[PDB]
Design a protein around this ligand. Structure first.
Ligand SMILES: *[C@@H]1O[C@H](CO)[C@@H](O)[C@H](O)[C@H]1NC(=O)CCCCCCC(C)C
Ligand SMILES: *[C@@H]1O[C@H](CO)[C@@H](O)[C@H](O)[C@H]1NC(C)=O
Ligand SMILES: *[C@H]1O[C@H](CO)[C@@H](O)[C@H](O)[C@@H]1O
Ligand SMILES: C[As](C)(=O)[O-]
Ligand SMILES: C[As](C)(=O)[O-]
Ligand SMILES: [Zn+2]
Ligand SMILES: [Zn+2]
Ligand SMILES: [Zn+2]
Ligand SMILES: [Zn+2]
Ligand SMILES: [Zn+2]
Ligand SMILES: [Zn+2]
Ligand SMILES: [Zn+2]
Ligand SMILES: [Zn+2]
Lengths: 377, 7
């Protein structure tokens, strides 16, 4: 069902697909092979439906974590970059595209939360979480707060919770131990305790969500927020003089945001695996290839060293990459659903007092590990 | 569900 002698590519419509099409035109001028870039709605939930029947695109772009599922279903071609090519990309990005020890996609770009701060309120942002309470009191004396960020989703709160030793699933040798959940260890308790104290002591409000925080920061009401590169254009619009920097440390250790790696996977059913490898390796994953996509819609930090070094002259991108390198690649396993569910509940419950930190994390641990312990139905 | 396992 997949046409031989051409490349069909699916990529999210919020990406620089026109720039990607430009890379395709360059490919076609060189080889006479036509490259079609499409951006189907919910493409990542369509792919596993159609690919299962031997149809779909030759190449699919999505966040790496979805690829675990595809690989489990045998929907992705194993890729074969040599060592010289692999050395062109940051090692940790390769970690994001491994399933059962196999490389199943090419890393393209990297996203992670950073500390975003108001340069006018705060020219010298805190290096530590611990100094934020003192800073809050000082700022609030003039009716500004130190920090507002989304507290409703583990994605945003996990970096602090994980800093001193929390983790979702233990990463071992390009594999995850789904029975090793790090939700209720002393590291997570410390982090969550500090977070809950911030809320209990009114340094932060338990109700703060994504929109509230974004609004407050972009209006100059709070000196700091925690968000990703997807938020920058909204701040550009606000005219706030903002900086983007490394997340504060906690107990001397980096905050550990989850890292999302935009990745390009090859349809197992494709008759054009060689064409796709050539396109991805020698056309897209070059300075010129990524720049063409980046110009259409900024990629953020990229997996390709040579081009990241150029983009990193923008300190916001340098900060994204730094936070990413200090962060936790998002596990690409289906058991993550039980982690999110359980932790989301645990943080809500603990910040609202409905449970102690110890009890919330214990239950979360039990629930996350239990739902990870089995599969089927 | 309706299929078994376990995976
Ligand atoms: C099936 O698994 C569910 C989740 O553990 C249970 O709640 C439910 O009671 C179980 N049903 C049965 O035990 C009937 C099983 C018939 C054999 C199913 C397994 C075989 C390998 C398909
Ligand atoms: C189901 O999976 C569990 C491990 O999760 C295993 O102990 C059991 O043998 C499996 N049963 C099957 C595949 O029938
Ligand atoms: C569990 O998930 C696997 C993924 O390959 C399926 O094949 C199975 O039928 C069940 O949905
Ligand atoms: C699959 As059963 C609950 O009969 O062991
Ligand atoms: C599916 As079972 C091994 O918990 O009976
Ligand atoms: Zn579209
Ligand atoms: Zn995802
Ligand atoms: Zn080579
Ligand atoms: Zn305090
Ligand atoms: Zn283990
Ligand atoms: Zn993402
Ligand atoms: Zn150029
Ligand atoms: Zn309990």
């Amino acid at each position: 069902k997949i046409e031989e002698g051409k490349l069909v590519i699916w990529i999210n419509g919020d990406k620089g697909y026109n720039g990607l099409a430009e890379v395709g035109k360059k490919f076609e001028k060189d080889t006479g092979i036509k490259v079609t870039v499409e951006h189907p709605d919910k493409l990542e939930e369509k792919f596993p439906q159609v690919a299962a029947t031997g149809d779909g695109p030759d190449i699919i772009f999505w966040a790496h974590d979805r690829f675990g599922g595809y690989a489990q279903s045998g929907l992705l071609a194993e890729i074969t970059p040599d060592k010289a090519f692999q050395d062109k990309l940051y090692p940790f990005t390769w970690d994001a595209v491994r399933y059962n020890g196999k490389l199943i996609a090419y890393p393209i770009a990297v996203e992670a939360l950073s500390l975003i701060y108001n340069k006018d309120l705060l020219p010298n942002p805190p290096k530590t979480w611990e100094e934020i309470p003192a800073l809050d009191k000082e700022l609030k004396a003039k009716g500004k707060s130190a920090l507002m960020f989304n507290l409703q989703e583990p994605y945003f709160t996990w970096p602090l919770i994980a800093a001193d030793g929390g983790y979702a699933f233990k990463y071992e040798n390009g594999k995850y131990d789904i029975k090793d959940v790090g939700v209720d260890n002393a590291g997570a308790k410390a982090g969550l305790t500090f977070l809950v104290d911030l809320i209990k002591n009114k340094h932060m409000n338990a109700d703060t969500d994504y929109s509230i925080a974004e609004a407050a920061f972009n209006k100059g009401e709070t000196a700091m927020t925690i968000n990703g590169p997807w938020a920058w254009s909204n701040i550009d619009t606000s005219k706030v003089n903002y900086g983007v920097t490394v997340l504060p440390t906690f107990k001397g250790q980096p905050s550990k945001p989850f890292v999302g790696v935009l990745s390009a996977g090859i349809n197992a059913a494709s008759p054009n695996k060689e064409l796709a490898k050539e396109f991805l390796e020698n056309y897209l994953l070059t300075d010129e290839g990524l720049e063409a996509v980046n110009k259409d819609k900024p990629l953020g930090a990229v997996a390709l060293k040579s081009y990241e070094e150029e983009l990193a002259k923008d300190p916001r991108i340098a900060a994204t990459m730094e936070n990413a390198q200090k962060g936790e690649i998002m596990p690409n396993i289906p058991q993550m659903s039980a982690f999110w569910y359980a932790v989301r509940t645990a943080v809500i419950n603990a910040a609202s007092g409905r449970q102690t930190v110890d009890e919330a994390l214990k239950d979360a641990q039990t629930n996350a590990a239990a739902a990870a312990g089995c599969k089927x139905x | 569900x309706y299929x078994x396992x376990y995976x």
